[PDB]
Amino acid sequence: SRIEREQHHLIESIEKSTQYMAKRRIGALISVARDTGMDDYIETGIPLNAKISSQLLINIFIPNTPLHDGAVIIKGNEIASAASYLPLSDSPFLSKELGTRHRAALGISEVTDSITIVVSEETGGISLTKGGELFRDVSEEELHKILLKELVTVTAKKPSIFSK
Ligand SMILES: Nc1ncnc2c1ncn2[C@@H]1O[C@@H](CO)[C@H](O)[C@H]1O
Ligand SMILES: [Cl-]
């Protein structure tokens, strides 16, 4: 496969699934691994090793289901695990009206270079964490630009399965 295609499909899959869940107030927590590995947190969840799709991301987070209680971790071109533990931030700067999903997303962002996306159970707002910072209630346009900048690392070049 071709990474550029993989990376844009990942972005689209996050955008479509979080849009779907935001409209319905479905809580979600999706962490995308980058240069810092998250293998230890993958091991805490239920292994999926699945192809990335918006449909599977949505089905995972349906409330009161086996896979919904925790984080999804995406590693390379797979949904690696669901219902994974992430470390909680102890920061007193995180607003008290945000839930544990936000605290978990902040916590993993403080110890990895991962990009984590949260859909709020209470408001449907979409938030993102990176490097110990929270980007709260981002618009669809803002989410798109952030994901483009952080998850697409290849410019326009010749497609090839050997790219890596
Ligand atoms: N340690 C954790 N790691 C990942 N998600 C967590 C953790 N603790 C709570 N959550 C999230 O909080 C619950 C609701 O806020 C979600 O079901 C779950 O994803
Ligand atoms: Cl929430």
PDB file of C-alpha atoms and ligand atoms in Angstrom:
ATOM      1  CA  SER A   1       0.000   0.000   0.000  1.00  0.00           C
ATOM      2  CA  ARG A   2       0.922   3.693  -0.291  1.00  0.00           C
ATOM      3  CA  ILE A   3       1.425   5.729   2.897  1.00  0.00           C
ATOM      4  CA  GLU A   4       0.111   8.986   1.473  1.00  0.00           C
ATOM      5  CA  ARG A   5      -3.145   7.188   0.685  1.00  0.00           C
ATOM      6  CA  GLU A   6      -3.066   5.547   4.133  1.00  0.00           C
ATOM      7  CA  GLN A   7      -2.492   8.828   5.960  1.00  0.00           C
ATOM      8  CA  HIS A   8      -5.275  10.703   4.183  1.00  0.00           C
ATOM      9  CA  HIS A   9      -7.653   7.767   4.693  1.00  0.00           C
ATOM     10  CA  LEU A  10      -6.814   7.834   8.402  1.00  0.00           C
ATOM     11  CA  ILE A  11      -7.620  11.549   8.548  1.00  0.00           C
ATOM     12  CA  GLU A  12     -10.898  11.034   6.688  1.00  0.00           C
ATOM     13  CA  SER A  13     -11.788   8.131   8.973  1.00  0.00           C
ATOM     14  CA  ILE A  14     -11.238  10.244  12.101  1.00  0.00           C
ATOM     15  CA  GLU A  15     -13.196  13.146  10.626  1.00  0.00           C
ATOM     16  CA  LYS A  16     -16.204  11.073   9.549  1.00  0.00           C
ATOM     17  CA  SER A  17     -16.376   9.017  12.746  1.00  0.00           C
ATOM     18  CA  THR A  18     -15.988  11.968  15.131  1.00  0.00           C
ATOM     19  CA  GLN A  19     -18.577  13.922  13.124  1.00  0.00           C
ATOM     20  CA  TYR A  20     -20.971  10.984  13.429  1.00  0.00           C
ATOM     21  CA  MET A  21     -20.371  10.583  17.161  1.00  0.00           C
ATOM     22  CA  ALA A  22     -20.370  14.328  17.906  1.00  0.00           C
ATOM     23  CA  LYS A  23     -23.871  14.757  16.422  1.00  0.00           C
ATOM     24  CA  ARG A  24     -25.173  11.969  18.676  1.00  0.00           C
ATOM     25  CA  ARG A  25     -23.188  12.896  21.840  1.00  0.00           C
ATOM     26  CA  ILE A  26     -21.249   9.622  21.781  1.00  0.00           C
ATOM     27  CA  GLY A  27     -18.069   9.848  23.835  1.00  0.00           C
ATOM     28  CA  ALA A  28     -14.888   8.752  22.094  1.00  0.00           C
ATOM     29  CA  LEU A  29     -11.141   8.695  22.694  1.00  0.00           C
ATOM     30  CA  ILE A  30      -8.799   7.958  19.771  1.00  0.00           C
ATOM     31  CA  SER A  31      -5.015   8.125  20.148  1.00  0.00           C
ATOM     32  CA  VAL A  32      -2.767   8.029  17.059  1.00  0.00           C
ATOM     33  CA  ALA A  33       0.804   6.877  17.701  1.00  0.00           C
ATOM     34  CA  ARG A  34       3.656   8.717  15.969  1.00  0.00           C
ATOM     35  CA  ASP A  35       7.424   8.510  16.647  1.00  0.00           C
ATOM     36  CA  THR A  36       6.954   7.618  20.330  1.00  0.00           C
ATOM     37  CA  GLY A  37       5.607   4.086  20.555  1.00  0.00           C
ATOM     38  CA  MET A  38       2.496   3.226  22.552  1.00  0.00           C
ATOM     39  CA  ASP A  39       2.902  -0.548  22.537  1.00  0.00           C
ATOM     40  CA  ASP A  40       2.482  -0.752  26.317  1.00  0.00           C
ATOM     41  CA  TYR A  41      -0.924   0.946  26.208  1.00  0.00           C
ATOM     42  CA  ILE A  42      -1.970  -1.188  23.235  1.00  0.00           C
ATOM     43  CA  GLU A  43      -1.328  -4.236  25.409  1.00  0.00           C
ATOM     44  CA  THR A  44      -3.795  -2.997  28.046  1.00  0.00           C
ATOM     45  CA  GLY A  45      -6.739  -3.078  25.637  1.00  0.00           C
ATOM     46  CA  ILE A  46      -8.567  -5.595  23.477  1.00  0.00           C
ATOM     47  CA  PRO A  47      -6.512  -6.401  20.347  1.00  0.00           C
ATOM     48  CA  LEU A  48      -8.179  -5.633  17.020  1.00  0.00           C
ATOM     49  CA  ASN A  49      -5.313  -5.210  14.512  1.00  0.00           C
ATOM     50  CA  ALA A  50      -8.009  -4.023  12.129  1.00  0.00           C
ATOM     51  CA  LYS A  51      -8.211  -2.024   8.936  1.00  0.00           C
ATOM     52  CA  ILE A  52      -8.961   1.641   9.617  1.00  0.00           C
ATOM     53  CA  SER A  53     -12.478   2.770   8.727  1.00  0.00           C
ATOM     54  CA  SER A  54     -14.956   5.353   9.953  1.00  0.00           C
ATOM     55  CA  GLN A  55     -17.561   2.596  10.366  1.00  0.00           C
ATOM     56  CA  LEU A  56     -15.416   0.492  12.700  1.00  0.00           C
ATOM     57  CA  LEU A  57     -14.423   3.527  14.788  1.00  0.00           C
ATOM     58  CA  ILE A  58     -18.125   4.351  15.225  1.00  0.00           C
ATOM     59  CA  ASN A  59     -19.167   0.803  16.161  1.00  0.00           C
ATOM     60  CA  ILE A  60     -16.370   0.622  18.754  1.00  0.00           C
ATOM     61  CA  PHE A  61     -17.646   3.567  20.809  1.00  0.00           C
ATOM     62  CA  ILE A  62     -21.350   2.674  20.958  1.00  0.00           C
ATOM     63  CA  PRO A  63     -22.301   3.076  24.644  1.00  0.00           C
ATOM     64  CA  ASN A  64     -22.551   0.051  26.949  1.00  0.00           C
ATOM     65  CA  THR A  65     -20.721  -2.253  24.522  1.00  0.00           C
ATOM     66  CA  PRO A  66     -17.642  -4.418  25.203  1.00  0.00           C
ATOM     67  CA  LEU A  67     -15.203  -2.239  23.228  1.00  0.00           C
ATOM     68  CA  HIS A  68     -16.289   1.264  24.231  1.00  0.00           C
ATOM     69  CA  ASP A  69     -14.806   1.670  27.746  1.00  0.00           C
ATOM     70  CA  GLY A  70     -11.394   3.154  27.054  1.00  0.00           C
ATOM     71  CA  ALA A  71      -9.160   4.423  24.275  1.00  0.00           C
ATOM     72  CA  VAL A  72      -8.764   3.281  20.694  1.00  0.00           C
ATOM     73  CA  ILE A  73      -5.087   3.246  19.703  1.00  0.00           C
ATOM     74  CA  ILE A  74      -4.123   3.539  16.036  1.00  0.00           C
ATOM     75  CA  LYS A  75      -0.631   2.304  15.156  1.00  0.00           C
ATOM     76  CA  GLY A  76       0.648   2.587  11.609  1.00  0.00           C
ATOM     77  CA  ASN A  77      -2.196   1.550   9.347  1.00  0.00           C
ATOM     78  CA  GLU A  78      -4.252  -0.424  11.885  1.00  0.00           C
ATOM     79  CA  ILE A  79      -6.738   0.132  14.649  1.00  0.00           C
ATOM     80  CA  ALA A  80      -4.475  -1.727  17.081  1.00  0.00           C
ATOM     81  CA  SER A  81      -6.662  -1.920  20.193  1.00  0.00           C
ATOM     82  CA  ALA A  82      -9.836  -0.665  21.826  1.00  0.00           C
ATOM     83  CA  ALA A  83     -10.707  -0.192  25.511  1.00  0.00           C
ATOM     84  CA  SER A  84      -7.062   0.677  26.258  1.00  0.00           C
ATOM     85  CA  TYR A  85      -5.751   2.451  29.342  1.00  0.00           C
ATOM     86  CA  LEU A  86      -4.107   5.852  28.960  1.00  0.00           C
ATOM     87  CA  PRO A  87      -2.370   7.629  31.852  1.00  0.00           C
ATOM     88  CA  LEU A  88      -4.436  10.417  33.378  1.00  0.00           C
ATOM     89  CA  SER A  89      -3.011  13.908  33.618  1.00  0.00           C
ATOM     90  CA  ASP A  90      -2.795  15.280  37.147  1.00  0.00           C
ATOM     91  CA  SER A  91      -2.732  18.841  35.803  1.00  0.00           C
ATOM     92  CA  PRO A  92      -4.856  21.262  37.873  1.00  0.00           C
ATOM     93  CA  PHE A  93      -5.082  23.466  34.762  1.00  0.00           C
ATOM     94  CA  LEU A  94      -7.502  21.111  33.001  1.00  0.00           C
ATOM     95  CA  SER A  95     -11.028  22.456  33.411  1.00  0.00           C
ATOM     96  CA  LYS A  96     -13.136  20.662  36.016  1.00  0.00           C
ATOM     97  CA  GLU A  97     -16.126  20.442  33.657  1.00  0.00           C
ATOM     98  CA  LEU A  98     -14.206  18.104  31.329  1.00  0.00           C
ATOM     99  CA  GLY A  99     -14.452  14.357  31.859  1.00  0.00           C
ATOM    100  CA  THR A 100     -11.983  11.527  32.271  1.00  0.00           C
ATOM    101  CA  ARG A 101     -11.613  11.091  28.488  1.00  0.00           C
ATOM    102  CA  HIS A 102     -10.083  14.560  28.311  1.00  0.00           C
ATOM    103  CA  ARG A 103      -7.853  13.863  31.304  1.00  0.00           C
ATOM    104  CA  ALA A 104      -6.686  10.612  29.682  1.00  0.00           C
ATOM    105  CA  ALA A 105      -6.025  12.352  26.365  1.00  0.00           C
ATOM    106  CA  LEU A 106      -4.070  15.084  28.150  1.00  0.00           C
ATOM    107  CA  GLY A 107      -2.086  12.475  30.088  1.00  0.00           C
ATOM    108  CA  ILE A 108      -0.936  10.452  27.089  1.00  0.00           C
ATOM    109  CA  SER A 109      -0.001  13.708  25.319  1.00  0.00           C
ATOM    110  CA  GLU A 110       2.322  14.599  28.216  1.00  0.00           C
ATOM    111  CA  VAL A 111       4.464  11.459  27.784  1.00  0.00           C
ATOM    112  CA  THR A 112       4.239  10.707  24.036  1.00  0.00           C
ATOM    113  CA  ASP A 113       4.145  12.606  20.761  1.00  0.00           C
ATOM    114  CA  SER A 114       0.768  10.997  19.987  1.00  0.00           C
ATOM    115  CA  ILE A 115      -2.199  12.938  18.612  1.00  0.00           C
ATOM    116  CA  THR A 116      -5.363  12.161  20.565  1.00  0.00           C
ATOM    117  CA  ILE A 117      -8.928  13.083  19.594  1.00  0.00           C
ATOM    118  CA  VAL A 118     -11.815  13.265  22.075  1.00  0.00           C
ATOM    119  CA  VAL A 119     -15.551  13.503  21.492  1.00  0.00           C
ATOM    120  CA  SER A 120     -17.292  14.868  24.562  1.00  0.00           C
ATOM    121  CA  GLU A 121     -20.050  12.758  26.077  1.00  0.00           C
ATOM    122  CA  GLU A 122     -21.733  15.889  27.463  1.00  0.00           C
ATOM    123  CA  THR A 123     -21.425  18.491  24.682  1.00  0.00           C
ATOM    124  CA  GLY A 124     -20.477  16.627  21.511  1.00  0.00           C
ATOM    125  CA  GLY A 125     -17.517  18.977  21.230  1.00  0.00           C
ATOM    126  CA  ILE A 126     -14.387  17.579  19.609  1.00  0.00           C
ATOM    127  CA  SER A 127     -11.054  18.198  21.325  1.00  0.00           C
ATOM    128  CA  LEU A 128      -7.455  17.286  20.564  1.00  0.00           C
ATOM    129  CA  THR A 129      -4.350  16.868  22.724  1.00  0.00           C
ATOM    130  CA  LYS A 130      -0.711  17.170  21.669  1.00  0.00           C
ATOM    131  CA  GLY A 131       2.402  17.722  23.788  1.00  0.00           C
ATOM    132  CA  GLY A 132       0.599  18.525  27.025  1.00  0.00           C
ATOM    133  CA  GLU A 133      -1.814  21.013  25.445  1.00  0.00           C
ATOM    134  CA  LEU A 134      -5.569  20.818  24.903  1.00  0.00           C
ATOM    135  CA  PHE A 135      -7.359  22.198  21.861  1.00  0.00           C
ATOM    136  CA  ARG A 136     -10.934  22.356  23.089  1.00  0.00           C
ATOM    137  CA  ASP A 137     -14.110  22.286  20.965  1.00  0.00           C
ATOM    138  CA  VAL A 138     -12.441  22.661  17.575  1.00  0.00           C
ATOM    139  CA  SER A 139     -14.496  23.317  14.470  1.00  0.00           C
ATOM    140  CA  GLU A 140     -14.571  20.855  11.584  1.00  0.00           C
ATOM    141  CA  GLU A 141     -12.213  23.135   9.649  1.00  0.00           C
ATOM    142  CA  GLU A 142      -9.836  23.404  12.624  1.00  0.00           C
ATOM    143  CA  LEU A 143      -9.813  19.643  13.209  1.00  0.00           C
ATOM    144  CA  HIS A 144      -9.086  19.095   9.509  1.00  0.00           C
ATOM    145  CA  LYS A 145      -6.119  21.477   9.477  1.00  0.00           C
ATOM    146  CA  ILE A 146      -4.601  20.043  12.669  1.00  0.00           C
ATOM    147  CA  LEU A 147      -4.896  16.451  11.446  1.00  0.00           C
ATOM    148  CA  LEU A 148      -3.416  17.404   8.060  1.00  0.00           C
ATOM    149  CA  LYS A 149      -0.438  19.107   9.692  1.00  0.00           C
ATOM    150  CA  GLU A 150       0.265  16.415  12.279  1.00  0.00           C
ATOM    151  CA  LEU A 151      -0.678  13.134  10.539  1.00  0.00           C
ATOM    152  CA  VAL A 152       0.351  13.729   6.901  1.00  0.00           C
ATOM    153  CA  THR A 153       4.143  13.677   6.600  1.00  0.00           C
ATOM    154  CA  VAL A 154       4.492  13.167   2.820  1.00  0.00           C
ATOM    155  CA  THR A 155       4.037  15.798   0.115  1.00  0.00           C
ATOM    156  CA  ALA A 156       2.904  15.256  -3.489  1.00  0.00           C
ATOM    157  CA  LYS A 157       5.251  12.620  -4.925  1.00  0.00           C
ATOM    158  CA  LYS A 158       5.215   9.416  -6.956  1.00  0.00           C
ATOM    159  CA  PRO A 159       2.925   6.729  -5.474  1.00  0.00           C
ATOM    160  CA  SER A 160       4.672   3.498  -4.531  1.00  0.00           C
ATOM    161  CA  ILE A 161       4.115   0.624  -2.123  1.00  0.00           C
ATOM    162  CA  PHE A 162       7.795   0.830  -1.085  1.00  0.00           C
ATOM    163  CA  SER A 163       7.618   4.359   0.344  1.00  0.00           C
ATOM    164  CA  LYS A 164       7.664   3.828   4.155  1.00  0.00           C
TER     165      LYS A 164
HETATM  166  N1  LIG B   1      -7.295   5.436  32.147  1.00  0.00           N
HETATM  167  C1  LIG B   1      -8.155   5.687  31.005  1.00  0.00           C
HETATM  168  N2  LIG B   1      -7.702   5.482  29.792  1.00  0.00           N
HETATM  169  C2  LIG B   1      -8.537   5.728  28.775  1.00  0.00           C
HETATM  170  N3  LIG B   1      -9.811   6.167  28.825  1.00  0.00           N
HETATM  171  C3  LIG B   1     -10.186   6.349  30.083  1.00  0.00           C
HETATM  172  C4  LIG B   1      -9.419   6.130  31.211  1.00  0.00           C
HETATM  173  N4  LIG B   1     -10.163   6.428  32.311  1.00  0.00           N
HETATM  174  C5  LIG B   1     -11.356   6.815  31.857  1.00  0.00           C
HETATM  175  N5  LIG B   1     -11.307   6.745  30.576  1.00  0.00           N
HETATM  176  C6  LIG B   1     -12.471   7.138  29.758  1.00  0.00           C
HETATM  177  O1  LIG B   1     -13.427   7.729  30.609  1.00  0.00           O
HETATM  178  C7  LIG B   1     -14.738   7.154  30.373  1.00  0.00           C
HETATM  179  C8  LIG B   1     -15.772   8.252  30.379  1.00  0.00           C
HETATM  180  O2  LIG B   1     -15.176   9.529  30.565  1.00  0.00           O
HETATM  181  C9  LIG B   1     -14.596   6.386  29.063  1.00  0.00           C
HETATM  182  O3  LIG B   1     -15.500   5.301  28.961  1.00  0.00           O
HETATM  183  C10 LIG B   1     -13.134   5.958  29.060  1.00  0.00           C
HETATM  184  O4  LIG B   1     -12.646   5.915  27.728  1.00  0.00           O
HETATM  185 CL    CL B   2     -16.629  13.158  27.777  1.00  0.00          CL
END
